[PDB]
C-alpha cells in the first residue's frame, strides 16, 4: 500500500534566479522511507522546474526518481538518490543529458565518494551532491500528508521552512559538469 | 587571444576534509606565464570549493586572481597570487570575508615579505602563503592543453600528480586567520 502526499513549494533560490511555485503529489512507495520521501522532495525543490517530474524510480527498472524531459521525450535530466551502483551510474550518463546523484548516508557516502572518485571523473555531465544525514533524517521527522514548505535557496546553502519545523543544510558538490 | 586551458582536478585533502573532482577552463592571458597559470590552478586546489571562480586576467587590474562571492556580490574569498601593493591588500580585506596572497616568484616574496610583515599584520582575515620557486617553476613544465591531476594535500604537504610528471610542495603559511 503507496500512501500519496501533497506538498505546496514556495521556492526563492537566489543562486538561480529561481522564484516559483508548485503543487506537488507524491505517492510514497511502501519500500521508500519518510527520510527518503523527504529527500525527493527535497531533491525536486533543488531542481525545480515547470517540467520536473517524479519517476517511478523505485520500480527500478527503467526510471529515475526525478526527471526532466525534452518535448522529444529524451532525457535531459536524470536524477538518481542514493548510492546507485556503478552500472546504474554509467547508464544515467550515457542516457541523459545531465545526470545527477544525490547521496544523504552519512558515512557510507563518503566511503562511497573515496572508493569512486577516482572512477566518477570518467564522466563529463555528472553532478554528484551529498547531504548531511543528520539532516535528512530530521527533514523526514516534518513528513505530513499535506505539506506546506518555504524553501529558501542562497550562497549553495537550503533552508525548508513550514510552520511546523526547519531543516537548513548545505549540500556538498562532489562533481559538477564542466560549464 | 586567450589560450584555452582544461583541466580537471581530483581532489584529496585531509587537511580539509574535502574531496570532489572539478573540471575547470582557464584563459592563459597572453601576459600570464606558463609558471602563473599553473601557480593559479594550484590556488584553485588549495581553496577549492564548487563557487570558487577564477577572475578576468591581468587585463583587468582589479578582480582578484580566484574569488568567491555572495549573492550580494561580496567577495567570501579574495585571492591574489604575487606581490600586491599593501594598499590592494588593505582594501581586499575591507571587502572580503577572507583574502590570501599567494606568493611566488622567488626573491621577489621574501623581500616582499621583509618590507610588508608588519602592516599586514593589522588584517586579522588575511592569509599570507609562499610556494617555493623549484617546486612552482617543475609545475609551470607541467602545463598542458588538456590537463588531469589527482591532488593530494595532508599535512601541509601537496602532491599534484599527473601521467607526465609530478611536483610535491609544502606552503609555508606565513600569516593565517
Known amino acids: ?9 514556495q521556492i526563492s533560490d537566489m543562486d538561480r534566479g529561481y522564484y516559483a511555485n508548485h503543487s506537488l503529489t507524491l505517492a510514497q512507495h511502501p519500500s ?15 531542481f525545480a ?3 520536473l517530474e517524479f519517476g517511478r524510480g523505485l520500480s527500478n527498472d527503467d526510471e529515475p526518481d526525478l526527471w526532466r524531459r525534452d518535448y522529444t521525450g ?3 535530466l536524470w536524477i538518481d538518490l542514493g548510492q546507485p551502483d556503478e552500472s546504474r551510474v554509467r547508464k544515467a550518463c550515457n542516457r ?7 547521496g544523504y548516508g552519512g558515512q ?13 571523473g570518467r564522466y563529463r555531465n555528472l553532478r554528484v551532491i551529498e547531504l ?17 514548505f518555504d524553501v529558501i535557496i ?26
Not at 500500500?1 to 513549494?9: D, G, I, K, S, Y
Not at 541523459?96 to 544525490?102: C, K, L, P, T
Open 1 to 9: 500500500t503507496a500512501t500519496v502526499r501533497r506538498a505546496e513549494l
Open 32 to 46: 521508500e522511507t519518510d527520510e527518503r520521501l523527504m529527500v525527493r522532495l527535497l531533491a525536486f525543490a533543488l
Open 49 to 51: 522546474d515547470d517540467r
Open 74 to 76: 529524451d532525457p535531459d
Open 96 to 102: 541523459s543529458r545531465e545526470a545527477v546523484v544525490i
Open 108 to 120: 557510507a557516502t563518503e566511503t562511497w565518494w573515496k572508493k569512486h572518485a577516482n572512477a566518477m
Open 132 to 148: 548531511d544525514s543528520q539532516a535528512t533524517e530530521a527533514l523526514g521527522a516534518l513528513i505530513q500528508r499535506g505539506m506546506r
Open 154 to 179: 542562497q550562497d549553495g546553502e537550503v533552508q525548508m521552512l513550514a510552520d511546523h519545523g526547519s531543516v537548513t543544510l548545505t549540500p556538498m558538490v562532489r562533481q559538477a559538469p564542466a560549464e
